[PDB]
Design a binder for this molecule. Structure first.
Ligand SMILES: [Cl-]
Ligand SMILES: [Cl-]
Ligand SMILES: [Cl-]
Ligand SMILES: [K+]
Ligand SMILES: [Mg+2]
Ligand SMILES: [Mg+2]
Ligand SMILES: [Mg+2]
Ligand SMILES: [Mg+2]
Ligand SMILES: [Mg+2]
Ligand SMILES: [Mg+2]
Ligand SMILES: [Mg+2]
Ligand SMILES: [Mg+2]
Ligand SMILES: [Mg+2]
Ligand SMILES: [Mg+2]
Ligand SMILES: [Mg+2]
Ligand SMILES: [Mg+2]
Ligand SMILES: [Mg+2]
Ligand SMILES: [Mg+2]
Ligand SMILES: [Mg+2]
Ligand SMILES: [Mg+2]
Ligand SMILES: [Mg+2]
Ligand SMILES: [Mg+2]
Ligand code: NA
Ligand code: NA
Ligand code: NA
Ligand code: NA
Ligand code: NA
Ligand code: NA
Ligand code: NA
Ligand code: NA
Ligand code: NA
Ligand code: NA
Ligand code: NA
Ligand code: NA
Ligand code: NA
Ligand code: NA
Lengths: 119, 194, 237, 46
RNA sequence: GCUUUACUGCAGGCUGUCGCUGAGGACUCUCACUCCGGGAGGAGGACACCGAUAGCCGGGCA
RNA sequence: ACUCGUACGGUCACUGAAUCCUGCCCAGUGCAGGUAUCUGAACACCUCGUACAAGAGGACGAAGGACCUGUCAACGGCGGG
RNA sequence: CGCACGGAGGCGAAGAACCACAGAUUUCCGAAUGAGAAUCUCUAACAAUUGCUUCGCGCAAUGAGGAACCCCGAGAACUGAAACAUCUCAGUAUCGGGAGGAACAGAAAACGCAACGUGAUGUCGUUAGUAACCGCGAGUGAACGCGAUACAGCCCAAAC
C-alpha cells in the first residue's frame, strides 16, 4: 500500500502469473525477497513480482525504487500465496523475479509494456 | 551485494523519514488500540530480529509490548525523610523501559524464555518493543544447535535475573575495563554501587 | 496536621457516598433513529429520591417502559412524543432547532444525544432565545447565555416541583431526613471550632480564622478553604 | 452456635485427647497428661 | 504535637518551551489526538491530554 | 467520590431561632480584575569566544511582581493632640 | 512384638526382629488446578496463563517449597558530624521478582608498570587507606599491575 502507486487489473495479473509459471518450467525464476533483491542489483532481472498483502511492509518497501534505478520492470500481485504457488512453492512469496524467461519472453515483454503504459 | 535485510535496517535508522514514517503513523493508530502484550506472527523489523537470534521456526515467538514513557510513577513519602530523600518528580527507575517490556512479555508467556528484544518506536506517551521468546520445551528448539542453549535449567527466568542483552547492558557490563569496577561480576556482589 | 474533611470526601467512603442503591432512575432522553415516530403514554407519577421532585413513568409504543424527567403539568393518560417531528407541547422532547424561540425548556443536552445535562432541578428552566443553522443560544437558570448545537435535544416546559425552596426546614430533623438521601456529610462543624491540627482555621484562645479567608486558586487541597478565589466579598460597594 | 461436620470432628478429637494416661502405661514405664484441658478454665481453638 | 512573612526542601496549582505534531504575529485547514453518538455521523483539533523541562505561588507536607 | 446528581444544584467558609438592627475605614495583609511602561526563566534565535565545546552578552518576554482598580457578613482597625 | 521395664496374647528354623537398596500402599486440606468451603461439600474437569497443534486439553510448560548462599528490582531511620541540611549510618534494615547446587561473570570497540609490553572471567594475597571524593568538615575509598588458585575456548547475523 505505501509502496503501491498503481492498481494492476485482475486480467493483467492473471497474464503475469501465467507467464511466471511457464518461466519456472522453461527459463529461470528467483523465489523470495532476498533472492529477488539481488537479481535487481546484479541486473539479471527481467520482471519482478511483488505481493500486496505483505506484513510488515518493510520487507518489500525497497523493491519499487530499487527497480526504477535499475530499469527492471515490476508488477503487483494482490495475494502472497498466489505468487508463491506460481513460482512453484508450497508456501507463499512476498516477491519473485523472472531471471531470464523462456517461451514467455514475448508475453513478459508485453506485460512490461502494459505496465509502463499503466504508469 | 546488499541483502534485502539491509534495506529494512537502513529504513529504521531514520523512523521519522520516508515510507517508514508514513507506516508508523498508520500502524500506531492500531497499536494504541491493542493491549499491553500482543503476539504477532511476523517481526516488524526482520533484519533486527534475525540479527538477534530469531528464526522462522516452531517454538520461536514474537510479541509487541507497550510501556508508558517517562520517570518513576512514585508515591511521596508518608513518614519522616531528610530533604535528599523527599523527591518524587525527578526520580527515575534503574531498569530501562525496554527491560520492563521484556518482563511483561515473559510473564504473559510463563513457559517461554526471553531471547532478546528491540525497539519499534514510540508516540508521545508510550514506547513499543518487540520481544523474541523461545519455547525451551519444543523439540524443534531442543535440536537446534544455535538455540538449544536456552533450554538449560539455569536459563529459567533469565529475564528476571538480568541475563538478557538489555539486562546485561543496563547492569553496566558492557565495558570490560575502566568504569566496570562495581558492575562485574554482579551489582549485588559489588555492594549495589554500580 | 491531619487531612481536612474535604480531603476525606474524595476517598468515596460510605459516609460521603450517595445512597445510589436507593435511587430510581438515571434520567436521560430516549434514543430515536429518526422520523420521530416515538410516542408514549404517562402511566404514573413517582417521587424521585435523588432530586426531591416528581418523575413520570412512561410506556412507549415499542414496548419500552422508562422513567422521565417530568416538567410541570404532566399527568397520567397524557401522550408525550420524542423526536424531530414532535408536537410543540409541554412534556415533549425535540432538538432545539425544532423548538420555537421564547419557549421555556428543561433537561437540555450539552452535546447532542447525551440525554440532558442542564436545567433539571425543581421548578427551573432554560430559555431558548436565538436560532440559527449553526448555534442555538440558551439562557440557563444561572443567568448565563449558553451557545449550543441546535441538534441538542430538550424538553418543553419548566421542571416540576417548583417552589420547593420556598419553605424553611424549620428543624434539624427535617434537614437530616433530606441529607440522608444525598451524597453529603451532615451536620457541619465550623473550621474555626476545630483544633489547629484539623483545619487551617482551627486553634486559638477564641474562635476566629487565623488569616484572611480569601484563598488563591492555586492553593493545594488541604489548604483551599474559606472563600475560594473570591473576586470580592461582603455586600457593600 | 452451629457446628459443622469438620468442627465436630475436631471437638471430638479434643475430648478424646482429654483422657488420662492409662494405668498400665504407668507400670510399663515404671512411672502426667500435659494436655489436660478443662472446658471452663481452658480455651480450644476456632 | 502545633504555628508562622524562622532555615532548607517536597507535593500541588498556574505559566512558557520540547516531544506526540500534520496541510495551506495574525489566520485557514484535516490526518494524528480528544470528546459526543448504538451507528451513520457530529464537535473540537495540532490545541488539549500525556511525557520532559523552565519561572512564579506553595506550613498542604517533611 | 460528589453523581441514577445539574444552579430551586453542590461544593467551600462565616454567623447561629424570632424581633429591632448591622455605622465609618481598601493604608497594611489576603483574594480578584486590569495594565502604556518597568521587571520577569528555559528552548529556539543573534553577537563574541572555542577548527567543536565549556562560557560571556543580546534580542524577545509567559505566568508572576512593580503600578492601577474592586472588595470588610475578607484578615482586621475605629487613636494622641 | 518403637519410645515404654504392664497384663493378656502372639510372631520367629516356612530364618522373625533388625539394617541397606528397590518396589507396593499412601485418607482429607495444602501451589491445589471442575466448582464452592475454617481440612467439608456440590455436578466430569491440566482452574488460570501459555507453546505445539491431528485446533480435541491431543502433546507439553508454568505455579509452590527449601538453612542460608545467589541474581534482578524498591529502598528508610535511629546514628555519626559532639546542633544540622550535603555528607554519614547505607545501597544497610525491610519490601517486590526469580535461578541453581552453587549462582553471577567470561573470550577485549580490554589494559595503558607507554611498551620491541600484558592477553577471557571469578576468587585469594597484595597494590593501599595509595589515587579519587568531601559544609575539602567529619568521614568516604578504588583500579592497572604483581604473587597465587583454576584454566578453555567457541556459536550466530550478513556476504556467497
Ligand atoms: Cl525469561
Ligand atoms: Cl439542602
Ligand atoms: Cl601489563
Ligand atoms: K540523617
Ligand atoms: Mg561472585
Ligand atoms: Mg442519572
Ligand atoms: Mg439555605
Ligand atoms: Mg449519607
Ligand atoms: Mg456548624
Ligand atoms: Mg476545642
Ligand atoms: Mg495547619
Ligand atoms: Mg464566635
Ligand atoms: Mg468569630
Ligand atoms: Mg467422656
Ligand atoms: Mg467516553
Ligand atoms: Mg513543620
Ligand atoms: Mg478445589
Ligand atoms: Mg549529630
Ligand atoms: Mg562540624
Ligand atoms: Mg559509600
Ligand atoms: Mg586501571
Ligand atoms: Mg552453522
Ligand atoms: Na516466561
Ligand atoms: Na554508580
Ligand atoms: Na482559628
Ligand atoms: Na471455654
Ligand atoms: Na507532643
Ligand atoms: Na486595606
Ligand atoms: Na486591599
Ligand atoms: Na509412603
Ligand atoms: Na499442567
Ligand atoms: Na487443547
Ligand atoms: Na552529637
Ligand atoms: Na538534636
Ligand atoms: Na559533603
Ligand atoms: Na613488574
Amino acid at each position: 500500500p505505501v509502496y503501491v502507486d498503481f492498481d494492476v487489473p485482475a486480467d493483467l495479473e492473471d497474464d503475469a502469473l501465467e507467464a511466471l509459471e511457464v518461466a519456472r518450467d522453461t527459463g529461470a525464476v528467483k523465489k523470495g525477497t532476498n533472492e529477488t533483491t539481488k537479481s535487481i542489483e546484479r541486473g539479471s532481472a527481467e520482471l519482478v513480482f511483488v505481493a500486496e498483502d505483505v506484513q510488515p511492509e518493510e520487507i518489500v518497501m525497497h523493491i519499487p525504487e530499487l527497480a526504477d534505478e535499475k530499469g527492471v520492470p515490476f508488477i503487483f500481485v494482490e495475494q502472497q500465496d498466489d505468487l508463491g504457488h506460481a513460482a512453484g512453492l508450497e508456501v507463499g512469496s512476498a516477491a519473485a523475479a523472472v531471471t531470464d524467461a523462456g517461451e514467455a519472453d514475448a508475453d513478459v515483454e508485453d506485460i512490461a509494456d502494459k505496465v509502463e503504459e499503466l504508469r | 551485494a546488499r541483502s534485502a535485510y539491509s534495506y529494512i535496517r537502513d529504513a529504521w535508522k531514520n523512523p521519522g523519514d520516508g515510507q517508514l514514517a508514513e507506516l508508523q503513523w498508520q500502524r500506531q493508530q492500531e497499536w494504541r488500540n491493542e493491549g499491553a502484550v500482543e503476539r504477532i506472527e511476523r517481526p516488524t523489523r526482520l533484519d533486527k530480529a534475525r540479527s538477534q537470534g530469531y528464526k522462522a521456526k516452531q517454538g520461536v515467538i514474537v510479541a509487541r509490548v507497550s510501556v508508558r514513557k517517562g520517570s518513576a510513577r512514585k508515591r511521596r513519602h508518608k513518614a519522616g525523610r531528610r530533604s535528599k530523600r523527599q523527591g518524587v518528580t525527578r526520580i527515575t527507575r534503574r531498569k530501562d523501559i525496554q527491560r520492563v517490556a521484556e518482563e511483561r512479555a515473559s510473564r504473559t508467556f510463563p513457559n517461554l524464555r526471553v531471547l532478546n528484544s528491540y525497539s519499534v518506536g514510540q508516540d508521545g506517551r508510550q514506547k513499543w518493543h518487540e520481544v523474541i521468546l523461545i519455547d525451551p520445551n519444543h523439540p524443534a528448539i531442543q535440536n537446534d544447535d544455535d538455540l538449544s542453549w536456552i533450554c538449560a535449567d539455569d536459563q529459567a527466568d533469565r529475564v528476571f535475573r538480568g541475563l538478557t542483552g538489555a539486562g546485561r547492558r543496563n547492569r553496566g557490563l558492557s565495558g570490560k575495563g575502566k568504569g566496570s569496577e562495581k558492575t562485574r561480576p554482579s551489582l549485588r556482589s559489588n555492594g549495589g554501587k554500580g | 496536621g491531619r487531612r481536612i474533611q474535604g480531603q476525606r470526601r474524595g476517598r468515596g467512603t460510605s459516609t460521603f457516598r450517595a445512597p445510589s442503591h436507593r435511587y430510581k432512575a438515571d434520567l436521560e432522553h430516549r434514543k430515536v433513529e429518526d422520523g420521530d415516530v416515538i410516542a408514549g403514554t404517562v402511566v404514573d407519577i413517582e417521587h424521585d429520591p435523588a432530586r426531591s421532585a416528581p418523575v413520570a413513568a412512561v410506556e412507549f409504543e415499542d414496548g419500552d417502559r422508562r422513567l422521565i424527567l417530568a416538567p410541570e403539568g404532566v399527568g397520567v393518560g397524557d401522550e408525550l412524543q420524542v423526536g424531530v417531528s414532535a408536537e410543540i407541547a409541554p412534556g415533549n422532547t425535540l432538538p432545539l432547532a425544532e423548538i420555537p424561540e421564547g419557549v421555556p425548556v428543561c433537561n437540555v443536552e450539552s452535546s447532542p444525544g447525551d440525554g440532558g445535562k442542564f436545567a433539571r432541578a425543581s421548578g427551573v428552566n432554560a430559555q431558548l432565545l436565538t436560532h440559527d443553522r449553526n448555534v442555538a443560544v440558551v439562557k440557563l437558570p444561572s443567568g448565563e447565555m449558553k451557545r449550543l448545537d441546535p441538534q441538542c435535544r430538550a424538553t418543553i416546559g419548566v421542571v416540576a416541583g417548583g417552589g420547593r425552596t420556598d419553605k424553611p426546614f424549620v428543624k434539624a430533623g427535617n434537614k437530616h431526613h433530606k441529607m440522608k438521601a444525598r451524597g453529603t456529610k451532615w451536620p457541619n462543624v465550623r473550621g474555626v471550632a476545630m483544633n489547629a491540627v484539623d483545619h487551617p482555621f482551627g486553634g486559638g484562645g477564641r474562635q476566629h480564622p487565623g488569616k484572611p479567608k480569601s484563598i488563591s486558586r492555586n492553593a493545594p487541597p488541604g489548604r483551599k478553604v474559606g472563600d475560594i478565589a473570591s473576586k470580592r466579598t461582603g455586600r457593600g460597594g | 452456635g452451629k457446628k459443622s461436620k469438620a468442627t465436630k470432628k475436631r471437638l471430638a478429637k479434643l475430648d478424646n485427647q482429654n483422657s488420662r494416661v492409662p494405668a498400665w502405661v504407668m507400670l510399663k514405664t515404671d512411672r502426667r497428661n500435659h494436655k489436660r484441658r478443662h472446658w471452663r478454665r481452658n480455651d480450644t481453638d476456632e
